[PDB]
A = this chain, B = another copy of it.
Amino acid sequence: LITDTLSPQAFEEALRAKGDFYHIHHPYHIAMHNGNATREQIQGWVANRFYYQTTIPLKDAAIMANCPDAQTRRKWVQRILDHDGSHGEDGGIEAWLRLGEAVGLSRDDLLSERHVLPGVRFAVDAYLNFARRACWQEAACSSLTELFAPQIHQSRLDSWPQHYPWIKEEGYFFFRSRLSQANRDVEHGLALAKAYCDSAEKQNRMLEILQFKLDILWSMLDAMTMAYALQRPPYHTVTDKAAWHTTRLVLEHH
């Protein structure tokens, strides 16, 4: 715990040290990186991760709704544009659907969200709900696991083509696009954290918030592990069919 307020440089270093807990260290990621995941494991990952991807613009809109600073909103809205795109096959969500296709899944497989495991849903919804309820600065700074994301994107670009040659090359567009977007994102996110977190109290709080975000990512992979690596998807003792709920109940009727 921080007793005496860290300088902004030292606080940055403390944020960066949290990368030790990033999901690049989860066995699910490591198995994919080393060429040991099966096609079903990769498909399940893409389908489930789509739920996180389609939640990012919701979460960013939530931050904006809580942010009375127009200068910040002018910057933050670019994240929504990056994922939703402007008119057509544009943006990140579309690029993730093309990754779905590149690994053998249809657009409907992803858009229906029917494969999204409840453990994935609850972790991702925790992010959204934090963004809706916390102060905008705290919610904005919980993005800063993006500090670690270019490394993990690059890892996939480096390892997947030779372990999984069946993944269509269009599939890699999204990862490539994030090497630059994540960096532009953190330029702002860091600047904001270093400016906002100017007391030991705020610094310790922010470190716990970043841990929360790390926990969301790890928990998504835990759910995937249980369903696709360990033969223990929900209700496996009672049925061989998917029986979990498949609806964003507070945002859609059905």
Binds B, one of A34-42, A99-107, A236-244: A236-244
Assembly CA distance A234 to B250 (angstroms): 29
Kindly list chain B residues whose C-beta atoms are within 8 Å of the C-beta of A238: 20-21, 25
Which of B123, B130, B244, B253 is the one whose CB lies under 8 Å from A211? B244
Task: Decide yes or no whether A109 CB sits under 8 A from chain B.
Answer: no
**Residue A191, interface by CB 8 Å:** no
Q: Closest approach, in angstroms, between the C-beta of A47 and any C-beta of chain B?
A: 17
- Mask, A209-237, CB within 8 Å of B = 1, is 10110011011001101100010101101
Q: Which of B133, B211, B234 contacts A222 (CB 8 A)?
A: B234
Interface size on A, residues (CB 8 A): 47
A204 CB–B CB distance under 8 Å = yes
What is the CA–CA distance of A222 and B223 in the complex, to the nearest angstrom?
Answer: 8
A126-B125, A237-B26 known; A208-B119 Cβ under 8 A: no
- The answer to whether A235 and B125 have CB atoms under 8 Å apart is no
* Interface presence of A53 (CB below 8 A): no
Rounded to whole Å, the gap between the CB of A33 and the closest CB of chain B is 13
- Looking at the assembled complex, report how far the CB atom of A215 sits from the nearest CB atom of chain B, in whole angstroms: 4
Q: Is there contact, CB below 8 Å, between B129 and A125?
A: yes
Q: Chain A 16-30, CB within 8 Å of chain B: the 1/0 string?
A: 000011000111001
Say yes or no for A163: interface residue by CB 8 A criterion: no
- A176 touches B (CB below 8 Å): no
Known A-B contacts A218-B235, A237-B25; the reply to A205 vs B122 at CB < 8 A is: no
Question: Given A211-B243, A215-B244, list of 9 further CB < 8 A pairs?
Answer: A21-B235, A122-B122, A122-B126, A126-B126, A208-B245, A208-B246, A212-B245, A218-B234, A226-B226
Contact residues of A with B, CB < 8 Å? 20-21, 25-27, 30, 118-119, 121-123, 125-126, 129-130, 133-134, 201, 204-205, 208-209, 211-212, 215-216, 218-219, 222-223, 225-226, 230, 232, 234-235, 237-238, 243-247, 249-250, 253-254
Closest 7 pairs between A and B when the two form their complex, measured CB to CB: A118-B215, A211-B245, A122-B122, A212-B245, A133-B250, A122-B126, A129-B129
